[PDB]
Amino acid sequence: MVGLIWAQATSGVIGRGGDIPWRLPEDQAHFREITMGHTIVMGRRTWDSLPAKVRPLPGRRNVVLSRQADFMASGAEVVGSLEEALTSPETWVIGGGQVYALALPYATRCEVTEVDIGLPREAGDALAPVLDETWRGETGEWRFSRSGLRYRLYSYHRS
Amino acid sequence: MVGLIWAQATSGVIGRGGDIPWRLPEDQAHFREITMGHTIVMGRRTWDSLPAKVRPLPGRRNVVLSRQADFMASGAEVVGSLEEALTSPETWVIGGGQVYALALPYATRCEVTEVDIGLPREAGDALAPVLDETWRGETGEWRFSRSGLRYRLYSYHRS
Ligand SMILES: NC(=O)C1=CN([C@@H]2O[C@H](COP(=O)(O)OP(=O)(O)OC[C@H]3O[C@@H](n4cnc5c(N)ncnc54)[C@H](OP(=O)(O)O)[C@@H]3O)[C@@H](O)[C@H]2O)C=CC1
Ligand SMILES: NC(=O)C1=CN([C@@H]2O[C@H](COP(=O)(O)OP(=O)(O)OC[C@H]3O[C@@H](n4cnc5c(N)ncnc54)[C@H](OP(=O)(O)O)[C@@H]3O)[C@@H](O)[C@H]2O)C=CC1
Ligand SMILES: CC(=O)Nc1ccc(-c2nc(N)nc(N)c2CCC2CC2)cc1
Ligand SMILES: CC(=O)Nc1ccc(-c2nc(N)nc(N)c2CCC2CC2)cc1
Numbered sequence A, B: 001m002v003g004l005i006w007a008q009a010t011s012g013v014i015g016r017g018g019d020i021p022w023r024l025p026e027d028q029a030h031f032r033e034i035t036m037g038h039t040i041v042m043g044r045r046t047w048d049s050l051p052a053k054v055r056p057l058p059g060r061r062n063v064v065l066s067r068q069a070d071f072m073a074s075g076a077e078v079v080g081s082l083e084e085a086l087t088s089p090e091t092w093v094i095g096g097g098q099v100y101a102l103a104l105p106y107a108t109r110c111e112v113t114e115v116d117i118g119l120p121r122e123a124g125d126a127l128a129p130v131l132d133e134t135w136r137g138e139t140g141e142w143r144f145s146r147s148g149l150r151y152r153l154y155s156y157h158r159s
């Protein structure tokens, strides 16, 4: 099974320069709640974005998506295929932009935080998936982060 | 995964006299979208309340949690355990008021429609269970039904 979770600016950006152009403790607990205990899959670059000092994320089955037998994610599992990770019952695709579009076929749910930040689409930006006609959800209430940036939450299901 | 799904009055009422005292098509397409494909678990009263012309719910593993050995539900399994209904990887307890409180201990997700209705809790109503402190979630924003009614959804999570 697959879920996709990501935090995006309005413009669609999920990463820039290997980090995230914001920080939102409202989004952080949201992300911990949904993924705690479940399987988390991330691309290799996302894994690098995790300081070795919060790696792995605690309480979850950390899976790093790479292509070779020659990469070690230390404290995690390194699988050449997406499908090698989906051995558990809930699997959460936690980025970045590749795995998303790679996992979007297997996916029924997208949990999306939309940060109200005016972030023009720069080249090389990692981007949130392209959710076609099929997906359904509705716009949330613009909620106030202590950060001072509006955010809102989205949930999608498709069948 | 064990989810509990219900639509309730702002007083807590989910059913009364073997029927539902309201009608919300937006709820029905939502209830349908959430359960579609999955094991649905219902009480035997819930199962009866469905006219034949809507039995069983299409595209889902209907499981009826009942008590007669000679009880067969045309288009469903009759289990005694809740867990014998909890076989499935995604499992939705769809009612009713007793089956709910039975399952809540094994629930990781509660998914709630709240109809904005002046409905007293009268003896003989079916009600929604009480979500303990393990539960965390967000209060939806009041949307407007083509029935003409304000409703909002609740998603509650505990792990
Ligand atoms: N805002 C948010 O909500 C999120 C933000 N991010 C941000 O996303 C950014 C980076 O994400 P991105 O840049 O898209 O790179 P990824 O995180 O997607 O990692 C990509 C890597 O995964 C491996 N890979 C990709 N496709 C496959 C495949 N089909 N089979 C096997 N292995 C595969 C390769 O690793 P190798 O090269 O070793 O083969 C590739 O380099 C960071 O800034 C991160 O913080 C992260 C998560 C969500
Ligand atoms: N608004 C909504 O979202 C929904 C509303 N409703 C409403 O709820 C009302 C009825 O619900 P309710 O009255 O609570 O009855 P329930 O629907 O909760 O069904 C009660 C069932 O409990 C079963 N049961 C309980 N424990 C066990 C056990 N350990 N082993 C086996 N069977 C068990 C009984 O089986 P047996 O009977 O075989 O002993 C009985 O069928 C109606 O008005 C209905 O329309 C129902 C579903 C959804
Ligand atoms: C900035 C910080 O310190 N922590 C932090 C960073 C990102 C997220 C997050 N949030 C949402 N909504 N979806 C997601 N897929 C992610 C995950 C991204 C990562 C793989 C590591 C939450 C907290
Ligand atoms: C509106 C209409 O005509 N039918 C209708 C009645 C109820 C529900 C519903 N809704 C939520 N949120 N949870 C639920 N478990 C259920 C139903 C469970 C049962 C069938 C008996 C949806 C549509």
Ligand SMILES: [Co+2]
Binding pocket: A108, A157, A158, A159, B033, B034, B035, B036, B037
């Ligand atoms: Co589904």
